[PDB]
Design a protein around this ligand. Structure first.
Ligand SMILES: *Cc1c(COP(=O)(O)O)cnc(C)c1O
Ligand SMILES: *Cc1c(COP(=O)(O)O)cnc(C)c1O
Lengths: 473, 437, 473, 437
């Protein structure tokens, strides 16, 4: 059991006291503008605050405490070094004179250069706040491109594979595009025939991850690029799976026109329980003019924010991007270097293939198992549902991988161990996976048991939702 | 240097087990033409060296602590107790809470955040967070348009220009139409709302720091069947009548003012509060209270049909990763200060801003612009170009004079003050400004 | 179960890599001086290190997570603000030019003045590393004093109350003195009659806490001082219980000649699982010349470390004191001021006196219950063992108070809530103490049950001690 | 400001419950003459203002990061990963682990620390920590005198002068006798040890940085029935043969060199290692592995008859609070680097020290003093007063030239180099020294 911060409150109790002499409200603000009924915020002392949040953290797990083999999430170690790096730039105002923020602007420029070098892009924006935001940015960029070509009314469809992340099609709608889903081949890769059947002057772009969500590299990516090019279709790169090929291959060299990256995935920016993140967007020269403003450019006087771009799609969020996250990513790249990143990608892939071998040995199945990259998708043997096994792992002290995604594999177990996890950890995980298969159905269907809370009434939460402590409305 | 644990013997065994001849062999199935890319990156550096380089970059900047710059971000006190708690490894490194049984820490914290935001806005519900204030506004308006089924939008020019720019991008993408209502005397006049308008947007305090009477705007909107979206700084809600009390349907804003480090613009978080009756159109994650099999209180993500995993193309938004950690920092700030603590901080920044305005009125050639009453920010007409003034101020070691775009008027500059400013700081800034002018 | 860091090790595995180009030992160190067999230190990667210690912290409790009513420990809230305060002075070298360390020296001088203000002392040393270290320092000062007056051969005994902390008599020994314990009276205060029979030219000093370890103020302290002074006996103040009276009364005005303070108790310096701490020692002018060196003084140049003290007892530890702990205490005092410290003392007393009433109403006895100050000593009702109630508390999610001390009370429950604990917390604790008296004998004796580990085998640890992972020798 | 949670209504109720009329009435039984003392303290300040003042104080100092100062404390890299782990509230705010069931985190961490220190020292056991190196030495010598039942001590002048001063203080207190062995050519000549000697003390590397040949010292001590006590910097033990390897009975030292912030002298921690055979005389806390009621592995404080609570007047030492947290930081560092990582750090520091030694020797008038072989510190004979040189160097932005007391010789100054020093740093120092001289 654990109390809510609101239950810990006590009428009139004070916490932080940041003001010595409090002014009278009516001497500063006209009455009709003053709040009459105070907001019902907690009223607790600092000790209570500390115990509350420290207590909550103890009812929580993270990479720092547990192996998180979440496919499509790259739950790699988040170096403490980076938190120290970030605090070094905490006191900077986005509107302060740029001549006094050259250190910050330089870091942004350099990061942009490193990311372009790793993706093979010609220009880049570090502004988008997350991968999905990068998606919207790139799709709007592609849209501005077509409209600038007089094909604005004909290019109305966006193609995405059946194994795409939900954000892809959701983005098309946000961009005002219609979306068509192309089926994957028998090997889990793009079905060229189905693709050539969908390609036409009505297609604005094709969104792909490479490796794809099955952890497989699209071996015919160059052909796919060729087909898209002749049809005038822009090839969008969902860079969520970049961890698998960092330093070994670049999307730009594959023919991709626009790409987005997830610093909070591939580049160690902490997941923070959902966010925040950073979704830089790189593009080939022909799409550069449509990039959102501002861009960080290097001039002879120094670094500066460039707003002079007539064909820009405009702004996608305030200021210039999640700078502190950018600091983290810069530190990561400057620590590892090219050789460090390559070794990271190789070991991320090695851990994935190794763990795949261990699970198949335990009885797990892999419907699409060509050479696995940074991740793979397994299925439990017939009779077991991913859901229950996930709950069983929770009971055993492990965290389950991603489940029920991609959508093209029933009882999908999307496993991504990343490169920072050790061999013995992969083996311990595989052992737990194997042991759960020897557990009676009922034990599995009622797990977890020892966790701070057991399975929750999801029906109630959806039928009679209580969204706040005061549940108003 | 690197973070991989693998020893050479472990690598040999693993390669052998997966049938690979070497690490490079793991990539042998990729098209030969894309292999061995010419990537140029600086040579790896040990952690102490990486830190040295960071400090060198930091040494190049002039810290903005106690800066008088405004425009949506201000130098407020960042409480160490809040940063200490948010630095706990469990909060910092957890992923989105999809396995509730082991994520009650984050789940409950998010539920508490939702409650505080709702209360602050005087509204009923709020999502788990948006990227920032600007995107929150865009999502809030799109929500209003889906709810009313209309495509027209009226937005006060008093809304931060960057917010309006982001709003336009999201709007035109979906084919909606936006009309801007120019400010008059620093405030926005009551517009006539047509039945084609689905949302009316106004910010309070507005971009120039002026307090706006939201009441009539909400009525005007409702009179036409449109929803009223209010953009409001969260800290100000500690003392100003919240949009919810004015009849607002949706409230959005950026959380930087809730003790968050400025971080040269990011990351921070955005909030979106509304009526429970509009929950169906609400984008982003939402936490609900529930119970486990044994009857224990629990929290879990709910109504996920509004999101991308389940709804994909028809999801209310494509938002996946949000701004959870920073949203939690905001919640911790609100909890640490409480209702009276927040009110004091807000009042103090207003007091100092007003004292600064009074002092600045004595500077030769300087004229007031933002009309009274204003909050903790205000704009002045300067006798020299604002960008030129900010630069000269910086040369003297002061951060002030946030240039206001000409659409609002000529030679305008914003000035702000917070609870960490004292009389002596205001005087020092004024002398610096007199020297510059 | 939880693995030892040594068990997490893997041969050849690396963690931090702080050296780019590693030199060859042979080129810098002669072979005969080179270590042949590497120390068996753990070999773990950084993610493993993080999971190890994060995991260990989760198997630990502290003020940040739990109410710690430990008598004689003052487990008050340790403000996070202070950790940020200390970080600001991390990079200072004790031997750097003092002209470049005026900030650190000023802080030291100021804290010394504040502590002298609160204690009524004339001169002070911030050098001692902890309370007990301060005791030795103070007793050595008293010895230097007597020797300087030519009574070093005759002044050979140190008097201590039967209720004194073990460090007191232990200190007398480290200082070459004999020790004689004096019995307390029927009310738990000093027995003036037994004191007079002991006072004489053979007595070097009398060591007392005030309030004493029963949490009772020594109402006849002025007469005690008169008696000591009359016999030439120096009065030493064990300041561990200062939290009870800071701002309200000063040991200097009570007649004490020397005092030591515990910054890690009274002034919020964190307990750190045992240490480190800080034990400043203040003295009246007549004993000032024997203070250890160096002392912080302010000259016309600026602040400086003064080593010119011909009668100094010397040095008791390296450098000048635990500076970072001093920074924290300075921050504390500058935040609260006199009114804040007085309020703190009053509420610490109120919390103790209030909680005492709650406990007595649950059936607990208080053998010496005059007006309670910052703590009180209770004993369970007949038939119950403090040890068992302590373990029972653990099972209930609480932490027990100090047990079996002071030594003059059987089954002693020495409770000190401190001022930072809330009314409702005191009441929940009392409710728990009450509920435990209703639990069956077997339940209490076998508690705890849900903690990471249940009762440990102390006999085994003492009969067959395993002091290291390698258990060599 | 303050941290008490009490509202006025709660205070009112509590006072009624204890029968007090007010807060001051709680002290009414105290003698009237000591009440209302005249205490002068500055007025209270909010946390942001307290921080502002701290900032102002720190701004007055010239940071010592990358300093070339030596003498027991050096500017080594402080790994953020260690500081992040040691910042965890559970480690930071726990008290001595007397209730083991809920203190297994600190208990096991301490057991691991004891293990790492013993290993580093080449010995069998170690206590939970001493205050610092100096007092660890004092306690270590006293252990040897108690064990041997003798009162004589021979200490090399090569032992840090402050360590010897502290040793003398502790020794004379119990009536022990101390004889100092003067350094010859920078090293300690082998002494003749009488049967009245219970302890022979030598430091390696010594105060001047010279490596000492410990073998014969141990043999000379054992031949007379005395015990050999070695003072050794922990980091050096990563590459140098440990005292235990030479036959040392006791090893002590300061843990600052294990990634701990210099903090202007404290706090750090001291370690004390010895033979399991001498455990009965060991002062301080000692953790032992054991098992719980069901057979689960656990850790607990043991052999407490050596401590003050149980033994009081006859305790081995009066030590209570120790240096647990910083000792744990030391353990974390040792764990983070491992045997090879620690060896590399030690080697890099030696390499840079030697590189620096050669460079400074090129400055006219500069002559060597510490003979080869030396470690990561060395003393030079300068043409100018060391204190004067230290100041001149500081005025130029460099921290170096630790003045060496005349008991060692005239115009001597110590220099040190660490793993965070690069060629460019050494050259910059030489150029500055060239200028001052
Ligand atoms: C994580 C993910 C995204 C979305 O990125 P966010 O940063 O979460 O918005 C998109 N596509 C794939 C394949 C992903 O795994
Ligand atoms: C804590 C304590 C001590 C010893 O202080 P340390 O800082 O632990 O050395 C001495 N006397 C009393 C009464 C104490 O409570």
């Amino acid at each position: 059991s654990f109390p809510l911060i609101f239950e810990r409150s006590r009428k009139g109790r004070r916490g932080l006291k940041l003001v010595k002499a409090v002014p009278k409200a009516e001497d500063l603000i006209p009455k009709e503008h003053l709040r009459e009924v105070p907001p019902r915020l907690p009223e607790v002392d600092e000790l209570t605050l500390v115990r509350h949040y420290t207590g909550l953290s103890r009812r929580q797990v993270g990479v720092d405490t547990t192996f998180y083999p979440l496919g499509s999430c790259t739950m790699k170690y988040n170096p403490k070094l980076h938190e120290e790096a970030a605090r070094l730039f905490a006191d900077l105002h986005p509107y302060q004179d740029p001549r006094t923020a050259q250190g910050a602007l330089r870091l942004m420029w350099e990061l942009g250069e490193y990311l372009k070098a790793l993706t093979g892009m010609d220009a880049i924006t570090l502004e988008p706040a997350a991968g999905a935001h990068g998606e919207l940015t790139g799709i709007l960029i592609i849209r501005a491109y077509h409209e600038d070509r007089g094909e604005g009314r004909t290019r109305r469809v966006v193609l995405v594979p059946d194994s795409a992340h939900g954000s892809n099609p959701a983005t098309a709608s946000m961009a005002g595009y219609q979306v068509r889903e192309i089926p994957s081949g028998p090997e889990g890769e793009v079905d060229l025939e189905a693709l050539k059947r969908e390609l036409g002057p009505h297609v604005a772009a094709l969104m792909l991850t490479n490796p794809n969500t099955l952890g497989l590299f699209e071996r015919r990516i160059l052909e796919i690029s060729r087909l898209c090019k002749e049809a005038g279709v822009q090839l969008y790169y969902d860079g969520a799976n970049l961890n698998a090929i960092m330093g070994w291959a670049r999307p730009g060299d594959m023919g991709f026109d626009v790409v987005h990256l997830n610093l909070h995935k591939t580049f160690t920016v902490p997941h923070g329980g959902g966010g925040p993140g950073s979704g830089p967007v790189g593009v080939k020269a022909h799409l550069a003019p449509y990039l959102p403003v501002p861009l960080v450019e290097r001039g002879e006087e120094g670094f500066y924010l460039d707003f002079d771009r007539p064909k820009s799609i405009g702004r996608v969020r305030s200021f210039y991007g999640n700078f502190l996250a950018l600091v983290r990513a810069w530190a990561y790249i400057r620590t590892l270097g090219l050789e460090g990143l390559k070794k990271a990608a190789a070991l991320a892939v090695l851990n994935a293939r190794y763990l795949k071998e261990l699970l198949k040995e335990k009885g797990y199945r892999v419907p699409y198992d060509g050479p696995s990259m940074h991740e793979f998708v397994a299925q439990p043997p017939e009779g077991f549902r991913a859901l229950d096994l996930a709950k069983g792992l929770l009971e055993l002290g492990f965290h389950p991988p991603t489940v029920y995604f991609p959508l093209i594999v029933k009882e999908a177990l999307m496993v991504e161990p990343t490169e920072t996890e050790a061999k013995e950890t992969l083996e311990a995980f595989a052992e737990a996976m194997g042991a759960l298969l020897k557990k009676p159905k009922e034990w599995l269907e009622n797990a977890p048991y020892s966790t701070p809370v057991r399975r929750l009434d999801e029906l109630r939460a959806n039928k009679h939702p209580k969204l706040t402590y005061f549940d108003e409305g | 240097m690197d973070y991989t644990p693998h020893t050479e013997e472990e690598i040999r065994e693993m390669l052998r087990r997966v049938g690979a001849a070497s690490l490079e062999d793991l990539f042998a199935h990729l098209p030969k033409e894309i292999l061995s890319p010419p990537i140029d990156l600086p040579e790896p550096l040990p952690e102490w060296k990486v830190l040295e380089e960071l400090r060198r970059l930091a040494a190049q900047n002039l810290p903005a602590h106690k800066a008088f710059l405004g425009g949506g971000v201000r130098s407020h006190h960042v409480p160490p107790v809040v940063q200490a708690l948010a630095a706990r490894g469990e909060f910092l490194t957890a992923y989105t809470p999809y396995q509730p049984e082991v994520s009650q820490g984050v789940l409950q914290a998010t539920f508490e955040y939702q409650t505080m935001i709702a209360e602050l806005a005087g509204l009923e519900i709020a999502n788990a967070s948006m990227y920032d204030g600007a995107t929150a506004l865009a999502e809030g308006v799109l929500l209003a348009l889906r709810e009313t089924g209309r495509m027209g939008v009226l937005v006060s020019q008093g809304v931060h220009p960057e917010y309006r720019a982001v709003l336009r991008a999201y709007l035109e993408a979906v084919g909606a139409k936006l009309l801007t209502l120019p400010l008059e005397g620093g405030r926005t006049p009551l517009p006539e709302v047509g039945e084609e308008v689905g949302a009316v947007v106004v910010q309070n305090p507005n971009f120039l720091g002026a307090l706006e009477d939201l009441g009539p705007f909400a009525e005007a909107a409702h009179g036409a069947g449109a929803l009223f979206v209010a953009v409001a700084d969260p800290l100000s809600l500690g003392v100003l009548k919240p949009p919810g009390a004015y009849g607002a349907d949706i409230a959005v804003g950026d959380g930087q003012s809730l003790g968050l480090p400025m971080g040269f613009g990011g990351p921070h978080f955005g909030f979106l509060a509304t009526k429970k009756a509009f929950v169906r159109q609400l984008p982003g994650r939402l936490v609900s209270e529930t119970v486990d099999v044994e009857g224990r209180r629990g929290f879990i993500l709910t109504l996920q049909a509004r999101e991308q995993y389940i709804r994909r193309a028809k999801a209310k938004s494509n938002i996946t990763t949000n701004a959870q950690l920073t949203a939690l920092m905001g919640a911790m700030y609100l909890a640490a200060l409480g209702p009276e603590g927040l009110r004091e901080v807000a009042l103090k920044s207003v007091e100092m801003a007003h004292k600064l305005h009074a002092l600045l009125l004595e500077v030769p050639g300087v004229r007031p612009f933002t009309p009274k009453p204003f909050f903790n920010e205000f704009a002045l007409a300067l006798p020299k170009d604002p960008e030129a003034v900010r630069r000269a101020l910086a040369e003297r070691g002061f951060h002030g004079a946030t240039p206001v775009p000409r659409e609002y008027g000529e030679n305008l500059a914003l000035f702000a003050a917070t609870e960490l400013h004292e009389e002596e700081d205001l005087l020092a800034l004024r002398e610096a400004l007199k020297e510059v002018l």
